[PDB]
């Protein structure tokens, strides 16, 4: 799809599950691919802040 | 130079020993050690 | 350049996508590939490389 | 590939001492009868225990659907023998083995299989056709069939890049050293936990972690143990669906040995239940007995038995007859006491057995050597 806000945010739900169930590495992995596909696109301020 | 002479006179091992230590014993099964401490 | 002196002029083309296909299974001989790659899809991905 | 195989066996090894409750293993087994024309297994069972009856006339009707599938195996045959292809005839008849795999053990077994192999137009399709011999060796306990394909596979057909293949194959052999009751090679070769996909052998990459936790503590270091299964990422998702795998496993790393001791019987239960881990049951849990008085020992020269009796189960003399008999082993390496009831200690290896350390090497070494001269002095 072309709704890169809405993958930007599931990308974050992922990396919040993954450091929940405690695999750190894949957390990061769903964290930098979050930060790659947002930086191309207009971040909102709720999405840029809790990116960060 | 065959003696001979006496004639007349893991897969299936290694764990033979630690076996044979506790084949009489065990009969607890690990479970029943439980239940004594239990009553203890 | 003058014949003579050198005989051949050999030009070495930019690889085209079999050849880029072939220099990719050779680079990619040591690497732990997972089942499902595509080493032809990815020599098409890249077009005009250096090689 | 093949999917419910290994479930069948695992249920039948369960069916050894609890067959009271049918419905639990024979009622699936029954299902597994009735799905792939498993005739020779059905045979197998009724020999073992269950007469079957009126439930066989309808399994020989199956057992004409499998004549059925025989004549399949004849049609396919002679048309791709009639066809100028070659191997089109070994692909019919690989995958006819397959369903008599199903079948009969013997019947999918031997040539079947073997005559599909002889011909090797690739040498991919020569390593599945090994996996398949090396799973029905697997599940029917085959050491020597597990052998030839394990020899077969590791010799020759790894070589060239199947990066998956090698990958499943570690599975195949790790499983075979947990059947053995050699535990460390198999923690080992289970170090793929990233990778297992999700081999049929396998129920689930959740079984495969009970397995590589279970069988890695007991051969694992402490060191080895918060690197590779304390600190594992993969891991530990898997054990946060098990919450007695977590207790176990972290127990032991916590030294919470009051919890552990509780959680080793439960894992008893599982490993006699369990195929491919009954074997083994009594040591492994007696290993993890020795493995745990060493650890809490090796902190104190002088331990009171009844410090130990709080940090384990309550009754002192069953801690002192299990630190008995380990002692006597030569496990626990510690001098037990009476009256004064304090556990000491044992000789550091670097301290002064350094000097037993060469000696130990030196006998078998300085043997040779005596044997060796007479030789060539004649």
Known sequence: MDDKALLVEVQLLESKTYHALSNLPKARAALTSARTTANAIYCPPKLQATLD | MSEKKQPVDEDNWDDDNVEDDFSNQLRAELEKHGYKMETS | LRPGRIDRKIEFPPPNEEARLDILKIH????????????????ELMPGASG | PKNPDLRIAQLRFLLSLPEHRGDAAVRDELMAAVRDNNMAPYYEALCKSLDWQIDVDLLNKMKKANEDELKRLDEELEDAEKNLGESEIRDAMMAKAEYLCRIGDKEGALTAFRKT??????????????????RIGLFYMDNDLITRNTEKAKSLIE??????????????????????????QAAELFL????????????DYKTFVTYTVYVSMIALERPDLREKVIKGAEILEVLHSLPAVRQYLFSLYECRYSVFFQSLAVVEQEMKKDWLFAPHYRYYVREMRIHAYSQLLESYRSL???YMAEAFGVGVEFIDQEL???????????????????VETNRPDSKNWQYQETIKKGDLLLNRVQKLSRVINM
């Open chain 4, 159 to 184: 070589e060239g890049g199947d990066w998956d293949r090698r990958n499943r194959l570690k599975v195949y052999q790790g499983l075979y050293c947990v059947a053995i009751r050699d535990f460390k």
């Open chain 4, 117 to 134: 192999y002889d011909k090797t137009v690739a040498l991919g399709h020569r390593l599945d056709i090994v996996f398949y011999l090396l």
């Open chain 4, 192 to 203: 793929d936990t990233v990778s297992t996909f999700t081999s049929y052998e396998l129920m």
């Open chain 3, 28 to 43: 990619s001989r040591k690497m732990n590939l997972t089942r499902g790659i595509n080493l032809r899809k990815i020599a």
């Open chain 4, 304 to 306: 009171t038995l009844g």
């Open chain 4, 324 to 342: 008995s008999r380990f002692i006597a082993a030569g496990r626990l390496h510690c001098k037990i006491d009476k009256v004064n009831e304090i």
